[PDB]
């Protein structure tokens, strides 16, 4: 059954990432014994939650959730209301409020839409956060699309010197639909994950969350540019290489260029 989990993860890596929720539910139907293993291991699109007391949307993960209920980052309360939920420390809660506010301004500048959520769970040696974002594209347009963040960070605070070992694990779950130009409609689904670790000295001017943020900004600019290329580097060579009309006239030229390069090869040496 360890091979079954390996196959289950291999299957979700090959099926469309647009239908993770439906396929994961069916995969749990087919293997009910792996339900707990698959829900933890298989990454899926983030759920929308609504805080009724504040009147604001928050996002749901395994880390912020304790049992059936999920701590809202705005009110600090779980829905449904649990008696003794796993809350953070009063210092970490104040830090968590400042994280939410900081990453609220983060998202709103990069996307200018959607919803985010930030939750920080208390550790003895550190403070570890999750930064969720979900932005939806223009619904009226034929081109649908969304962008989803799952930045999990682990900060190991050192005792002396005020330095902090950060460990960022960032997933980016994308699905671009393209229905335009009167030539057909294409739907592209991406899912790259990148890891980054760093030790930064703590400043009194800028808190530790700002140090975390700097990793997110740099990671997102790089992951995005990496993603961007893995799209083209494959959608270009593979599709063009299959059905290129200019392949057959250039093949005759390449064969001429093969004689030519061979003549160049001898002449370059001497």
């Amino acid at each position: 059954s360890d091979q079954q989990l390996d196959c289950a993860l291999d299957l979700m890596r090959r099926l469309p990432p647009q239908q993770i929720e439906k396929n994961l539910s069916d995969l749990i139907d087919l293997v009910p014994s792996l339900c707990e293993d698959l829900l933890s291991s298989v990454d899926q699109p983030l759920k929308i939650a609504r805080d009724k007391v504040v009147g604001k949307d928050y996002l749901l993960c395994d880390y912020n959730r304790d049992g059936d209920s999920y701590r809202s980052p705005w009110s600090n309360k779980y829905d449904p209301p649990l008696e003794d939920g796993a809350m953070p420390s009063a210092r970490l809660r104040k830090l968590e409020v400042e994280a939410n506010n900081a990453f609220d301004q983060y998202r709103d500048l990069y996307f200018e839409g959607g919803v985010s959520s930030v939750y920080l769970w208390d550790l003895d040696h550190g403070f570890a956060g999750v930064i969720l974002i979900k932005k939806a594209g223009d619904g009226s347009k034929k081109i649908k699309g969304c962008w989803d963040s799952i930045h999990v960070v682990e900060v190991q605070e050192k005792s002396s010197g005020r330095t902090a070992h950060y460990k960022l694990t960032s997933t980016v779950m994308l699905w671009l639909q393209t229905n335009k130009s009167g030539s057909g409609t294409m739907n592209l689904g991406g899912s790259l994950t990148r890891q980054m670790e760093k030790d930064e000295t703590v400043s009194d001017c800028s808190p530790h969350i700002a140090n975390i943020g700097r990793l997110v900004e740099d990671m997102e600019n790089k992951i995005r540019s990496t993603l961007n290329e893995i799209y083209f580097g494959k959608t270009k060579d593979i599709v063009n290489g299959l059905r290129s009309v200019d392949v057959i006239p250039d093949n005759p030229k390449f064969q001429q260029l093969q004689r030519e390069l061979s003549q160049v090869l001898t002449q370059r040496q001497i």
């Binding site: 290329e229 580097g233 200019d246 006239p249 001429q256 030519e260 160049v264 002449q267």
Partner: protein
């Protein structure tokens, strides 16, 4: 009509020219058209009123300098025609355009309309017997004597990392930016105004290029240089007045690695180099890492190659042998390759003849290049 062909290596900053089968380009001069600002009162003044090359370099202060070509894309076509006419004229080459075949160069992945209009100029206005446009990276490898390897380059207009493996220039793995020496010179000019010493004039713009060429260095750790206070070194201008440069000299060439500082989204030189290696096939990546060739003027900063090596070590997979090689004459690397390519007997097959252009048109030029 198979006479000794001419190699006009184009470029936004500098334009090289000369004959095939030569060691160095004899005719190098900056790619711009200087025109007189002031009113010519006195008789027996500078005649012509359109200055190109060494006359324009000699008489900077009179002339309002303007560049025809930005980011490997000519804006003013009349200016480039005058430059090409000056290249062929008696003041530089001492030849006719009708006798010799032409080897042209351009940056990769440019607009095709400019390539078509370039060919129109060579075939119609000049009466060229045969034309051939080529890549810069392909030539630079022919100059060195290798076939395999990536060619990172940095002129005044374009920076592009082209991966090649045994005479197979992958058109898809070519990365490119519109960030280069001109943008670094513009960013240094902006920093000098923040320091105090303002330069706004077009003749005065070339003093900023001269300061960028001479008094600049790329630090390995930029955060460490930001925390430390600079020494504020001096430099004498063409007039005589001294200028304390300050922290502008080291923060200016950071634009190439951090393109966010000017205010435009791009990858960067070090990212482009990693990115050109990644887009190619898995088996060919380790050979591409081992052979990395440098070229262009904006690779000549102090500690540039050392910073490139550190950036590759950070991004690339671990336990891989990195080697960023470079020739002695980095400025004339592309032209030497063209002179070698032109001297070869194969060159007759590749070119676009004037008869073939008159029959087909632009389609034949698009087919022969790739």
């Amino acid at each position: 009509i198979a006479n000794q062909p001419v190699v006009i290596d184009n470029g936004s900053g500098v334009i090289k020219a000369g004959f095939a089968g030569d060691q160095i380009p004899k005719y190098c001069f900056p790619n711009y058209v200087g025109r007189p600002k002031h009113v010519r009162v006195m008789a027996g003044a500078l005649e012509g009123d359109i200055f190109i090359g060494p006359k324009a370099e000699e008489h900077r202060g009179l002339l309002s300098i303007r560049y025809p070509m930005e980011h490997g894309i000519v804006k003013d076509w009349n200016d480039m025609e005058r430059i090409w006419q000056y290249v062929y004229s008696k003041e530089q080459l001492q030849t006719f355009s009708e006798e010799h075949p032409v080897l042209l160069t351009e940056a990769p992945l440019n607009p095709r309309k400019n390539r078509e209009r370039a060919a129109e100029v060579f075939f119609e206005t000049f009466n060229v017997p045969a034309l051939f446009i080529s890549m810069q990276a392909v030539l630079s490898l022919y100059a060195t004597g290798r076939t395999t390897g990536v060619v990172l380059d940095s002129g005044d207009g374009v920076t592009h990392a082209v991966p090649i493996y045994e005479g197979f220039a992958m058109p898809h793995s070519i990365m490119r930016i519109d960030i280069a020496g001109r943008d670094v010179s513009r960013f240094l000019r902006l920093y000098l105004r923040k320091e105090g010493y303002d330069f706004h004039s077009s003749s005065e713009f070339e003093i900023v290029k001269a300061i960028k060429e001479r008094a600049c260095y790329l630090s390995i750790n930029p955060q460490k240089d930001e925390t430390l206070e600079t020494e504020k070194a001096q430099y004498y201008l063409p007039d005589g007045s001294t200028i304390e440069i300050g922290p502008s000299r080291f923060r200016a060439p950071e634009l190439l690695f951090r393109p966010d500082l000017i205010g435009e989204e791009s990858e960067g030189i070090h990212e482009v180099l990693v990115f050109a290696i990644q887009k190619s096939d898995m088996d060919l990546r380790r050979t591409l890492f081992s052979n990395i060739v440098l070229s262009g003027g904006s690779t000549l900063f102090k500690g540039f190659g050392d910073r490139l090596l550190s950036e590759v070590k950070k991004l690339a997979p671990k336990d891989v042998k990195i080697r960023i090689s470079a020739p002695q004459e980095r400025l004339y690397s592309t032209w030497i390759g063209g002179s070698i390519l032109a001297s070869l007997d194969t060159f007759k097959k590749m070119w676009v003849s004037k008869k073939e252009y008159e029959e087909d048109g632009a389609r034949s030029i698009h087919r022969k290049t790739f």
